[PDB]
Amino acid sequence: ASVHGTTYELLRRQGIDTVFGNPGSNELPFLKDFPEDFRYILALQEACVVGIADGYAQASRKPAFINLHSAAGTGNAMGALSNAWNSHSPLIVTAGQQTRAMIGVEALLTNVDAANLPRPLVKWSYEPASAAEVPHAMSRAIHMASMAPQGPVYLSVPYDDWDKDADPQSHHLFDRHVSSSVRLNDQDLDILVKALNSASNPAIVLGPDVDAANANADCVMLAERLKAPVWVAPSAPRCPFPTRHPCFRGLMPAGIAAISQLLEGHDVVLVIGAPVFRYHQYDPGQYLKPGTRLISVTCDPLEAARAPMGDAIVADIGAMASALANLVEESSRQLPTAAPEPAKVDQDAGRLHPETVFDTLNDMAPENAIYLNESTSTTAQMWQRLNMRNPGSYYFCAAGGLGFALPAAIGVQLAEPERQVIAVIGDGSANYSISALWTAAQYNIPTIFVIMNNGTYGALRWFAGVLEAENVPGLDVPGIDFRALAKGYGVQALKADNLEQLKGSLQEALSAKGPVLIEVSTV
Amino acid sequence: ASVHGTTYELLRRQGIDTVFGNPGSNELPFLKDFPEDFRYILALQEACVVGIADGYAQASRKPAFINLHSAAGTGNAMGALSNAWNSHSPLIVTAGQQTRAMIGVEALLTNVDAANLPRPLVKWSYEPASAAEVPHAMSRAIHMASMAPQGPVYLSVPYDDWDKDADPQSHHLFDRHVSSSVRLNDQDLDILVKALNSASNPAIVLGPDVDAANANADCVMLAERLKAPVWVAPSAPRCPFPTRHPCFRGLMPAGIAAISQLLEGHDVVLVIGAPVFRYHQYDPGQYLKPGTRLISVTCDPLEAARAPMGDAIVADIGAMASALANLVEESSRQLPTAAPEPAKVDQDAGRLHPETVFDTLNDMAPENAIYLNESTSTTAQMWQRLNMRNPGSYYFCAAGGLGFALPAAIGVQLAEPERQVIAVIGDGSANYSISALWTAAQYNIPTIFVIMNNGTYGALRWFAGVLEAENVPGLDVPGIDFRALAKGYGVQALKADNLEQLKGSLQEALSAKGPVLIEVSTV
Amino acid sequence: ASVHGTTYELLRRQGIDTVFGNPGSNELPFLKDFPEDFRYILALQEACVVGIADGYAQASRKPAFINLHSAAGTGNAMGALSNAWNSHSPLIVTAGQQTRAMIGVEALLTNVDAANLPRPLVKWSYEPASAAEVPHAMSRAIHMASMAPQGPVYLSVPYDDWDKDADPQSHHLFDRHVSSSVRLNDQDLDILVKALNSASNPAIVLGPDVDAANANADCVMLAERLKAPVWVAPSAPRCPFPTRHPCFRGLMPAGIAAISQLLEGHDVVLVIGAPVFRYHQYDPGQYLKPGTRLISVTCDPLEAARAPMGDAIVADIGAMASALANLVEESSRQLPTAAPEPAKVDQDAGRLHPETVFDTLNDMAPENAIYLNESTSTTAQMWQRLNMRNPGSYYFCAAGGLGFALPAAIGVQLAEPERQVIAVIGDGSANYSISALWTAAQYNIPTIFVIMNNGTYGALRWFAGVLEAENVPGLDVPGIDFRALAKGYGVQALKADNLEQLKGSLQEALSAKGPVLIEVSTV
Ligand SMILES: Cc1ncc(C[n+]2csc(CCOP(=O)(O)OP(=O)(O)O)c2C)c(N)n1
Ligand SMILES: Cc1ncc(C[n+]2csc(CCOP(=O)(O)OP(=O)(O)O)c2C)c(N)n1
Ligand SMILES: Cc1ncc(C[n+]2csc(CCOP(=O)(O)OP(=O)(O)O)c2C)c(N)n1
Ligand SMILES: [Ca+2]
Ligand SMILES: [Ca+2]
Ligand SMILES: [Ca+2]
Ligand SMILES: [Ca+2]
Ligand SMILES: [Ca+2]
Ligand SMILES: [Ca+2]
Ligand SMILES: [Mg+2]
């Protein structure tokens, strides 16, 4: 069999049936005779291709396969890979290389020093030394992406390799099963459980890896047994806990001093599935106040190594969450009281306050809706106003790289056809991956995009305010008609200048049978 | 003085007065108190930022300064850097890094292993070890970008460095002058000149570095003295010779066998300012046929090293071109006869043949117009139908990375306010950097964008045809309304469905006082 | 023809006839059927292999070819490559890789991510994508190493490639000639010459690249014409000027303040072939005092970029030195007076003062002797006491990496059979590459090794003294019998405990017909 046939069989046998890409000439030999049981999802720019694959992978909880064009295609996708790295997204990125006969002369489209291009944003990067090695290299890519800590991998393949004969021994790769579903040994696990049972005032902090492992329900049980408040680690890329559960305490502020102050009084703080800690603003102070012991369970050695305080256990989040939830004793402490409902902000008949938008979305959206957030100055309000009861209900660019939510919303909707996806995106952020709209229109993926139009890079004007920075250029983005942009890409567009219109537009959008974009005029 | 003040003085003293960027929080400390004698050009996505800076640098023939946001901003610009590498574009790319106090914990927005991110697409990449080193590092960046062979450089700067005190000895950096304007020593130059004077049937092949050095006029003189035909090296990123000059022979096909066949009979082939050779399609054969001696003058050691045949001289193109043009004897051979005018293709009243579009542009555009090409399946026709008499009249993505022409056209227009820029872009290519349109509208840069709409990735369907590849998915891009996209970004839009409309639209576009986009329905 | 035959023909045609190496299994396929016109020089450890090749290349002024074993062999040679990088040594380092069929499974002896191993100490690093590409890759290696700025390159080759068929078009590589013998254009050169003719008190500073280019004589003429004092740039790896010439001023101290103080009063300082400046100790102060203008001529863009002051011209040192020496006017100023003879230090009948050793060597050694220095605490005395009239008379580890002089002395002696090589090495430094002695014995290369035995890492005890550092462990190296070590490797050994014995031992050593090691007891 050819390398082409062998490789598609490998993919199919490993559960991959979809290719997200933007084609090029070095990739034609791979894409020809495309298998009938496969599905190709085209996007117009590489950041969009990867963003869609990313949302698809995160929501489906399985690896996504991507095919890009040489160095330029790969380069266009590197901002998206920064987010994928931080979110532990299992992405298999393949790029076509020039024919081996012309790599040396560096003919046009040659990806020079290929493996180094995507570094340091990949777990593994490689270009095979011969055509017969391709299936084996593809196998390595699949497993490296899937093993904890999951992350993106890169494989460059010269286009002339596809038609060559594959090693007949490649059949051994087809059904390989690799597992990293491990947990702390019995003896040490018993010690940890005892420390938890003995704590007088424990607190639990959860990160994105909990939602990735679908360990949400196990963490709820753990929180209920320990009768402990639960916080979501700062700069949260996903939501790991039902936001209206009595133990829920909200999103932690992303500052050193703010967090230690928040945890003061808690003798034992158990952090699960999050780095310690994804701070953002520089808020100097103590990492932890005296009297607090921190224990971290992470699926990533890099996270365990860099934590500036506490103990750590490197293991599978799902396996650990399940073990802990079943072994801890039920505390006789009283279960925490639920946080009160957020207040209603005064809303006149003019432009909409973000709070109003979120309250309305919470009112009108189905209970199993999935939200994506790329409205940077309104994140805190969004977290307090949306009741997200189920796992996989929230996504936000893990590395803070804009251009994620719009395409990712399409990938998530593709992965969860029965849950309405609603992406809330700022007018500034909307531009980074605007062409992704075309993919939703073409495949009729019913994502709803809500553009928060305030005409400025709000979050930046805010930091520009703290630093007390003046005369900073480039903070405003006036003159963009989002309805026209949506029309350009074949997506139905609506406008909301006030509350009445907002409610009407949402009613229509929710009843639509295709993707819809709503431009909202915000304060 | 602070690092901030010292750095802006360094830039100003080295001739930089414009910053192309997309702001972020790590960059606010650098951008605050923005100098009044500077100019900030905002673009909505990083590929667009770099593309604009690239066009500006290439057209002005001086380095362009760029400021991006951390890893995500840098990553979004890597496809654009692939083109910049191939075009020897002097680009100074700076990105903001997290505060030194939080780099270790990898707070959000930390650019991890920063210097490795842009590799291998940069000449030099670096992150200073202390704040006082910043001005010196900036100096290194400026010079590394400007010395032959020119190319992009990268500098990552922690945001807390800007307000620190600079080394008082930094003043020594302000007026440093670095030169690489060198040419072959007298003795060896005399030998080369003798070889040229002795040739019986010489041919000259010119590359992009000739136009970059503005050595066009010197090459015309050289060609006239030697009475030799002149070809433009394959995959041409720029036009180095007047296309209607009697010696002009056109664009060389990008294949090994095709080129050796084309050069057969020429005893001495002098290649100036081009790699040997930027092949594209695999057209196996002899690199050179017996009887042909090839001599290459390149400004790049990497080019000299990888040439599979001939001798090479590594030197400044301008200095070499000038020396050769003045030292060679006037041959008694007859000057080559000009190529005949291309034929008029039959055009009915329906959709436009690309040939018709180019003939019409040639008819109506000013004689000093500048063209950008990102209509991949029509490159050969474009080269035969446009009379480009002046230097800096043509640009095409040097690494074949789409998303270059649209933003680059804006940068070129900014650099040459008195020459009408006309970008000819395919409907597929238009999407990669569509948001750049906003920048033209906002600063009122009068670029004319001609979108060749044929609804498909034409060049790919063509390769898919040669390889005799079937069942290749993702080759069509239907359902895009370019007039709506232009409206979305504030740019006047026109449509041309036939010749009559094409002529009318061009008349209007040429008389416009701002940017204009014309969607052309092509066959 | 096979890749094996084609490659040896390429090497032979490019002037390479010697292979320096330490064999391994991945290299057997390359070494088999070793050409009869070639010469293989075996060394017992890789640092020794590279050190010998380095000395050979530096002294012969042509590239040296090296063959090492996979990652371990390459790794053992990386300290030696650090020196080669700093000395601009043209070294072609090749390493054998596992068979392509087993690279993927990482069988024993696989060099993983090969090209990244030697970085950042190489100009170019690469592993071919196919066997037919090997000759072309070898060609690139040869030229990259030879073009200015010269430096080490690395090529990894899977062992199964050698027996495959080579591309018949590879014959084009055989006689390629690449030149970088360039100099500043006429107009700018005239400006520089005028600045030199107009200077009232010029000073000249020379670096290692002057000796590498054999531009010594041209610099003497330049100094005599300008009637200017000449200094050797700090941390000198080579000697670029006759040390007893009336203009000679000695080795510059390696400190910022010390150098500016030394140059004070000189209006124009011309630096040729040296970085600006290879400082060592931290001696904070002004880089240059007011009134001094510095102009640097360097063959390295990296040097021009990082200079913290002055203008720079990037060009070939030989071409530039020759041009300047012939164009400057003869100044009417009086020629500088020669420095007085160094004083005789008092020497009793006990252990030898380093000054005594150097005076005696100067007295007894032939006038065309070549010295290598790796006696770190005695460098200043050595420079003042040895009259070195000819080019290529001195070598010192360019990156300060010990283990250079002993093997390099063998390589230099091999390159210059008619000039007596005398390596002066400290007892600490002698151990790093002690096994190199075997190579001298086996091929009967008559190098004389003088071991300065003082039982301690003297230079370190000295820095430990300045820093006023106390309780520093590991500074003494007692209990080493160098005569026994020499005997172990087959080299004649002598001992000198006092002056009488020193003179006697030197008389014998100079008359020897093979390598000799003299252990000298120093204070
Ligand atoms: C790729 C990328 N480029 C630039 C930035 C810097 N940045 C962070 S927030 C922001 C503002 C986003 O504006 P918008 O989406 O309109 O939302 P707002 O702040 O107004 O809520 C910008 C440009 C970024 N994080 N990522
Ligand atoms: C960043 C990038 N992505 C993908 C490609 C692959 N590619 C080469 S030509 C091409 C078609 C461009 O289509 P279009 O601009 O409509 O012009 P046409 O071929 O129809 O003339 C594509 C997608 C590329 N070279 N660069
Ligand atoms: C590979 C390497 N290891 C360690 C050092 C650090 N070092 C610099 S000088 C020195 C002392 C050398 O001792 P010796 O050769 O006996 O000479 P002395 O200082 O006594 O004159 C040492 C160990 C070095 N420069 N290179
Ligand atoms: Ca409500
Ligand atoms: Ca906004
Ligand atoms: Ca005409
Ligand atoms: Ca098209
Ligand atoms: Ca004497
Ligand atoms: Ca010693
Ligand atoms: Mg990289």
> Same domain, yes or no, for A244 and A275?
yes
Q: What are phi and psi of A280, to 5 degrees?
A: -135, -75
Domain boundary among the residues A178, A212, A234 is at A178
How far apart, in whole angstroms, are the C-alpha atoms of residue C408 and residue C54?
6
Q: Are C509 and C500 in contact (CB under 8 A)?
A: no
Q: 75-104 in C: which are within 8 Å (CB) of B?
A: none
Torsion of CA B94, B98, B101, B106, to 10 degrees: -130
Print burial letters for C255-286: b (CB count within 10 Å at least 16), e (below 16): bbebbbebbeebebbbbbbbbbbbbeeeeeeb
Judge if the upstream peptide bond of residue C248 is cis by omega within 30 degrees of 0.
no
Angle CA A97–A103–A108, to nearest 5: 70
> Same domain, yes or no, for A209 and A130?
no
Domain boundary among the residues A303, A322, A340 is at A340
The verdict on C129 touching A (C-beta cutoff 8 Å) is yes
Element (H, E) at B280: none
Residue C350's CATH number = 3.40.50.970
β-strand pairing of C182-184 with B182-184? antiparallel
Cα diameter, chain C: 74
Q: Are B51 and B404 in contact (CB under 8 A)?
A: yes
How far apart, in whole angstroms, are the C-alpha atoms of residue B296 and residue B303?
9
> Same domain, yes or no, for A380 and A239?
no
Tokens 């500006």 correspond to B56
How far apart, in whole angstroms, are the C-alpha atoms of residue A50 and residue A69?
12
Ligand 2 in reach of B404 Cβ (< 6 A) = no
Catalytic-labelled residue, pool A9, A21, A27, A96: A27
Report the sign of the C-alpha dihedral through residues C136, C137, C143, C146, in that order: negative
Smallest CA-to-CA distance from A266 within A182, A335, A337, A199 is with: A199
How far apart, in whole angstroms, are the C-alpha atoms of residue C428 and residue C426?
5
- A36: number of Cβ within 10 Å: 7
> Same domain, yes or no, for A392 and A411?
yes
> Same domain, yes or no, for C276 and C229?
yes
Q: What are phi and psi of C98, to 5 degrees?
A: -65, 165
Residue A212's CATH number = 3.40.50.1220
Report the sign of the C-alpha dihedral through residues B306, B307, B308, B313, in that order: negative
What is the experimental method? X-ray
Smallest CA-to-CA distance from B484 within A521, A481, A406 is with: A481
Angle CA B190–B195–B201, to nearest 5: 145
> For this structure, is A400 an active site residue?
yes
> Same domain, yes or no, for C269 and C238?
yes
> For this structure, is C172 an active site residue?
no
Print burial letters for C148-166: b (CB count within 10 Å at least 16), e (below 16): bbbbbbbbbbbbbbbeeeb
Ligand 1 in reach of B22 Cβ (< 6 A) = yes
- Give the count of alpha carbons within 13 A of C472, CB side only: 15
DSSP assignments along A334-359, one per residue: PPPPPPPPPPPPP--SSSBPHHHHHH
What six digits make up the tokens of B432? 């990669």
What six digits make up the tokens of A44? 């117009």
- Give the count of alpha carbons within 13 A of A447, CB side only: 35
> Same domain, yes or no, for C169 and C186?
no
The verdict on B252 touching A (C-beta cutoff 8 Å) is no
Chains in touch with C (≥3 Cβ pairs < 8 A): A, B
> Same domain, yes or no, for B496 and B451?
yes
What six digits make up the tokens of C470? 């106390």
Element (H, E) at B483: helix B482-488
Residue pairs spanning B and C at CB distance below 8 A:
132
> Same domain, yes or no, for B330 and B354?
no
Q: Are residues A121 and B117, on separate chains, in Cβ contact within 8 Å?
A: yes
> Same domain, yes or no, for B370 and B293?
no
Q: Are residues A136 and C105, on separate chains, in Cβ contact within 8 Å?
A: yes
Q: How far is the CA of B114 from the centre of ligand 1 (A)?
A: 21
Q: Are residues B185 and C185, on separate chains, in Cβ contact within 8 Å?
A: no
Could you tell me which residues are beta bridge partners of residue B450? B424, B518
Ligand 1 in reach of B151 Cβ (< 6 A) = no
A108, A472, A475 member nearest B254 (Cβ): A108
Write the single-letter amino acid at B442.
Answer: Q
Q: What are phi and psi of C113, to 5 degrees?
A: 50, 45
Q: What is the resolution of this structure in A?
A: 1.6
Smallest CA-to-CA distance from B147 within B301, B305, B306, B322 is with: B301
Smallest CA-to-CA distance from B83 within B358, B365, B397 is with: B397
Contacts 24+ apart (CB under 8 A), B506-511: B506/B360, B506/B361, B506/B364, B507/B364, B509/B448, B510/B364, B510/B365, B510/B366, B510/B420, B510/B448
Print burial letters for C467-486: b (CB count within 10 Å at least 16), e (below 16): eeeeeeeeeebeebebbebb
CA B51 to chain centre: 9
Contacts of B320 by beta carbon, 8 Å cutoff, 6+ apart: B183, B184, B215, B272, B297, B313
> For this structure, is A27 an active site residue?
yes
Smallest CA-to-CA distance from C80 within C50, C53, C122 is with: C50
* DSSP annotation of B238: B
Q: How far is the CA of C343 from the centre of ligand 8 (A)?
A: 10
- Helix boundaries (H) for A386-457: 405-415, 427-430, 437-443
What's the total number of domains in chain B? 3
Tokens 């990313």 correspond to A54
Could you tell me which residues are beta bridge partners of residue B41? B20
Q: Which domain holds residue C468?
A: 341-523
DSSP assignments along B75-134, one per residue: HHTHHHHHHHHHTT--EEEEEEE--HHHHTTT-TT--TTGGGSSTTS-SEEE--SSGGGH
Domain boundary among the residues B163, B178, B193 is at B178
β-strand pairing of B448-453 with B421-426? parallel
Q: Are A98 and A127 in contact (CB under 8 A)?
A: no
* DSSP annotation of A390: S
Name all residues whose Cβ lies below 6 A of ligand 3: C 79, 375-378, 400-403, 426-429, 432, 454, 456-460
Q: Are B314 and B304 in contact (CB under 8 A)?
A: yes
- C328: number of Cβ within 10 Å: 18
> Same domain, yes or no, for C23 and C157?
yes
Contacts of B249 by beta carbon, 8 Å cutoff, 6+ apart: B229, B230, B231, B336, B339
Contacts 24+ apart (CB under 8 A), C465-471: C466/C281
User: Looking at the CA of B362, which ligand is closest?
Assistant: 6
How far apart, in whole angstroms, are the C-alpha atoms of residue C411 and residue C20?
10
Burial of B198 from C-beta contacts in 10 A (0-12 / 13-18 / 19+)? exposed
* DSSP annotation of C170: G
C116, C129, C158 member nearest A103 (Cβ): C129
Q: How far is the CA of B315 from the centre of ligand 10 (A)?
A: 29
Q: Are C401 and C408 in contact (CB under 8 A)?
A: no
> Same domain, yes or no, for C395 and C458?
yes
